[PDB]
Structure formats: structure tokens, C-alpha cells
Design a binder for this molecule. Structure first.
Ligand SMILES: CCCCCNC(=O)[C@H](Cc1ccc(N(C(=O)C(=O)O)c2ccccc2C(=O)O)c2ccccc12)NC(C)=O
Length: 282
């Protein structure tokens, strides 16, 4: 079970140790492309790179690099593109990826500024009348409308391929209340955010993978993907409590390094799942 496992681990101050076990067991693959000198300025952090085998390739012939990894969960039959918060010079690449991968939704789990520094570039327009044009990738982005709520904001955006004049609707799911330090006391708001994403169909098969990101695209992004996949898995199994979240994180890490960066995010993940399951069945 995972319910009791939480018990055993929690009332034993074992989280820190469990997390370390994962780190030690986690997969390790080459990130050659990410380390090429010409891509140095396409990476926010020198210690956070995508494995070559699962990296997303931009369809351009100049440089197909972008710091983004395709996490492909076979059993749960769900795919996610985890990426770093874009940089002032990679916003065009970012939206090019959304277009090419036919993504329907973009999930943001951080704020543009946190701790007095920029953790992500302002990659989307804040005003309907002030659209954005990414000349390098020939794309136009317009803010159609947004619904601001207590712990998160949902925006309707229009992305247009200026080259073909084709347009699409992208939904921006911005969790705006992640705490300055640690993790949310309760996963309730986080769960509602997730369900809201699910409801839109952004995580469904008839669309490309959702694009998920925070700053490095491994920590908060990891809790989101881990929670979703675990919840979905419990829906497909005869024995829901057989789902081993640690096993799921380890599988996920085969596609992108460092998913879930602290014992806290790991614990929060268990919480989100455990609670999410109860809510779904009442
Ligand atoms: C993959 C190995 C990670 C090695 C550690 N590296 C780091 O922490 C950082 C990159 C880096 C990685 C992960 C982060 N991070 C993330 O959730 C994330 O943006 O992925 C967090 C890590 C620990 C605790 C909290 C958070 C959080 O934001 O809630 C970061 C959050 C803010 C700023 C940077 C971050 N590297 C450098 C050079 O500063």
C-alpha cells in the first residue's frame, strides 16, 4: 500500500532517506547536445540538462536545441514535456516547440520573479492589446482572456504561425501561489489546479504533450507529473494501492534528471496522490 507506507515513512523522519535512495538509484544518461558550446546560452542552469535520448528537437535546421525532455509513461499512457522556464532568448524556441509538438496546454508552476530574481522570462502577453511577435521563429501570440482565481490563473491564448497564417488556441495554466519556501501546507489547491488542467483536455491523447515548467523544470514540475501519472495509474489498476510512487518517479527520471528535488516535494507528492484518490471517489 501507499497509504500505510506514508505512515511508516512519515512518523519516522524517513523522507530524507527515502529521497536519497531514489537519487542514488536514479538513471544517468548522456546530455551531449545540451553541453555543446553553442547551446550554452539556451540553458538556464549549467547543472540542469535534458538527456539526449529523450530531448525535444525543434524542427528548425539551424539549431534544434531547447532544454526540454519528453517524459513518456507507457503504462499510464500519458506524455509530458518538462522544460525549463524559458530565457529571454529562448521564448521563440519555446513557442515553436508548443506549435510543433501540437501542445494544447502549458503548465506554469512558478512566478516570473521569486526571491528577488527572475526564475522565468515573461514569455506570454499580459495585455490583450499588446501581442507578442517572436521574429526568430515567426510566431505571434495574443492574450484572448484570462480567469484569475485565488491560487491560480487560467489564460486563453492565440498562437499563430505567421508563415502559414494558421492559428491555435493554447491554454495557459498558471499556478500562482506556490510558497516562497518549502511546499504548500495542503495539496488541495494543487489538486484543484491539476483537475482544472485535466478538464480542459490538455492532458489527453487527441493533443500533443502538455508543456510543464517551473524554473529548472524538474522540481515542482516533477510533483505535477508524478501526481497525475500516479492518479491515472490508480484508475487503470485492479488494485489501486499497488501503485508504487517511488517506482513511478524512478521511471520518470529515465526521461529527465532530478525530477523531484527535495524530500519535501517527494512527501508533498505522496500527499497529493493519496488525497487526490480520496477526492475522486468521494
Ligand atoms: C539536477 C541536479 C540539481 C542540482 C542543484 N541545482 C540547483 O538547485 C540549481 C537549479 C535549480 C533546480 C531546481 C529548482 N527547484 C525546482 O522546483 C525547479 O525549478 O525545477 C527547486 C529545488 C529545491 C527546492 C525548491 C525548488 C522550487 O523551486 O520549489 C530551482 C529553483 C530555483 C532556482 C534554481 C533551481 N542550479 C543552479 C546552478 O543554481
Amino acid at each position: 500500500e501507499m497509504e500505510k507506507e506514508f505512515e511508516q515513512i512519515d512518523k519516522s523522519g524517513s523522507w530524507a532517506a527515502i529521497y536519497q535512495d531514489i537519487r542514488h538509484e536514479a538513471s544517468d544518461f548522456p546530455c551531449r547536445v545540451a553541453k555543446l558550446p553553442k547551446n550554452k546560452n539556451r540553458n538556464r542552469y549549467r547543472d540542469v540538462s535534458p538527456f539526449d535520448h529523450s530531448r525535444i528537437k525543434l524542427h528548425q535546421e539551424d539549431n534544434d536545441y531547447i532544454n526540454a525532455s519528453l517524459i513518456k509513461m507507457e503504462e499510464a499512457q500519458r506524455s509530458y514535456i518538462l522544460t525549463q522556464g524559458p530565457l529571454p532568448n529562448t521564448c521563440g524556441h519555446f513557442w515553436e516547440m508548443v506549435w510543433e509538438q501540437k501542445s494544447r496546454g502549458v503548465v506554469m508552476l512558478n512566478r516570473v520573479m521569486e526571491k528577488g530574481s527572475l526564475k522565468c522570462a515573461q514569455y506570454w502577453p499580459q495585455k490583450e492589446e499588446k501581442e507578442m511577435i517572436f521574429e526568430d521563429t515567426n510566431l505571434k501570440l495574443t492574450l484572448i482572456s484570462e480567469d484569475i482565481k485565488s491560487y491560480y490563473t487560467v489564460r486563453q491564448l492565440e498562437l499563430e504561425n505567421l508563415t502559414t497564417q494558421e492559428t491555435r488556441e493554447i491554454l495557459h495554466f498558471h499556478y500562482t501561489t506556490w510558497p516562497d519556501f518549502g511546499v504548500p501546507e495542503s495539496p488541495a489547491s494543487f489538486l484543484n489546479f491539476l483537475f482544472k488542467v485535466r478538464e480542459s483536455g490538455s492532458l489527453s491523447p487527441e493533443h500533443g504533450p502538455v508543456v510543464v515548467h517551473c524554473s529548472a523544470g524538474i522540481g515542482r514540475s516533477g510533483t505535477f507529473c508524478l501526481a497525475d501519472t500516479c492518479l491515472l495509474l490508480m484508475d487503470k489498476r485492479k488494485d489501486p494501492s499497488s501503485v508504487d510512487i517511488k517506482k513511478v518517479l524512478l521511471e520518470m527520471r529515465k526521461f529527465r534528471m532530478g525530477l523531484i528535488q527535495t524530500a519535501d516535494q517527494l512527501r508533498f507528492s505522496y500527499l497529493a496522490v493519496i488525497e487526490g484518490a480520496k477526492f475522486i471517489m468521494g
